[PDB]
UniProtKB/Swiss-Prot annotation, chains A, B:
GO cellular component: cytoplasm
Taxonomic lineage of the native organism: Bacteria, Pseudomonadati, Pseudomonadota, Gammaproteobacteria, Enterobacterales
Annotated protein name in UniProt: HTH-type transcriptional regulator CysB
Quaternary structure and interacting proteins, as annotated: Homotetramer.
Subcellular location: Cytoplasm
Family statement drawn from the similarity comment of this UniProt entry: Belongs to the LysR transcriptional regulatory family.
Residues of the full protein shown: 86 to 324 of 324
Length: 239, 239
């Protein structure tokens, strides 16, 4: 209908990438739908994020899957995403017909800060291929990464959701989905958290397969591993 | 002339705000001027920044002044900057003729992460006025801060250099220079670092009053305090 009168607060701890490219539409929709809920969002490192909902006052952790770190939280898979290579049109990569990771490792890289927004998968891929990449520029934000790629500092590696040809018309995007293993964005919370109906609403808005029932089943499992296995038959959203 | 053949590396540890709004022009100019220097830049927290040049491999720390943290580095003042209030045109602040900090504290705030990019001065100002601000949104990036201000999450407080009416035409900027004490961006390095001529070039490009002589005098002082006092007669750049 119109709006809910529900009343309460919703504290989110998340990353730049989620805050910037994944959440604004969800949050806009939620804000008009749930007028009397005080929404809070604090960008943090994956460590800070886990700490914030684990020890602090965040209700929800929204971040890409990071080891046994969200271990004592209820973690739910929301969507899969991967990386795009960003270069200038005059870059040797732009000419190259199919670009591999040995071709990519030839160049200085401009990408995410270590342990952020799935850097691990980039590192792991290089380790696996026995290659040592020259990472010269590092940041939390795809925007400045793009800025420095356009100055010729090197080859950008960002999240594909952080690119758009409409808003970055002077760049060349190369999909690296066959180059890196995909990353999974997860939503998480403390088990002791009483899940308000707006909390269910929000979760399902951000992750449609996560209906109230499914969420309730997941908390009943008491393993994040079993929770992820719940969905191994279905194709999760790709972003 | 054209270019220098000089050869070496330049490792910079800095913040988002510097990387995004203060450095790209300097770096572009430096990159064509100093072709054979490998430039590296890694965004980090003020803690990471200090650690990186203090313990790690960064040559230069570029960040706003942060206590006895850069204590065992050579710190040089580069420029002063302050904050702007960012709201939507239909915000009560936009109508208000002169906006004070008691008027501002009436509203939920969208600003920098704690201990970042001069948050302290915002906090200190609120403490001094005996006011407790409702900070609902926090981030390292002015861009997403602006994004969430436009959704009506609250009142933005960013660096003035992070705003432009040309590139953010649908926002209202209010200068808060009489509201917050200014912040000072500083450049810093380890004393044992041999200062290459490109390093002097770069420093002076970023901070014109910091000529080779002046820089050399500053290292001779062996106090960051005396170094800052060297310039107390002149007006530092304002950004």
């Amino acid at each position: 209908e119109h709006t809910w009168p529900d009343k309460g607060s919703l504290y989110i701890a998340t990353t730049h990438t989620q805050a910037r490219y994944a959440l604004p539409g969800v949050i806009k929709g939620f804000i008009e739908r749930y007028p009397r809920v005080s929404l809070h969002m604090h960008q943090g490192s994956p460590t800070q994020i886990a700490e914030a909902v684990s020890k602090g006052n965040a209700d929800f952790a929204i971040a890409t899957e990071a080891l046994h770190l969200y271990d004592d939280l209820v973690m739910l898979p929301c969507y899969h995403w991967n990386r795009s290579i960003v270069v200038t049109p005059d870059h040797p990569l732009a000419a190259t017909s199919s670009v591999t990771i040995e071709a990519l490792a030839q160049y200085p890289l401009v990408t995410y800060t270590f342990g952020f927004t799935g850097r691990s998968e980039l590192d792991t891929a290089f380790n696996r291929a026995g290659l040592t990449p020259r990472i010269v520029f590092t940041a939390t934000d795809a925007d400045v990464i793009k800025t420095y790629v356009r100055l010729g500092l090197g080859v950008g590696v960002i999240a594909s959701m952080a690119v758009d040809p409409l808003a970055d018309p002077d760049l060349v995007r190369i999909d690296a989905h066959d180059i890196f293993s995909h990353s999974t964005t997860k939503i998480g919370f403390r088990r002791s958290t009483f899940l308000r109906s707006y909390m269910y609403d929000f979760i399902q808005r951000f992750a449609p397969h996560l209906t109230r029932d499914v969420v309730d089943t997941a908390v009943a499992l008491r393993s994040n591993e079993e929770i992820e296995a719940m969905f191994q038959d279905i194709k999760l959203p790709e972003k």
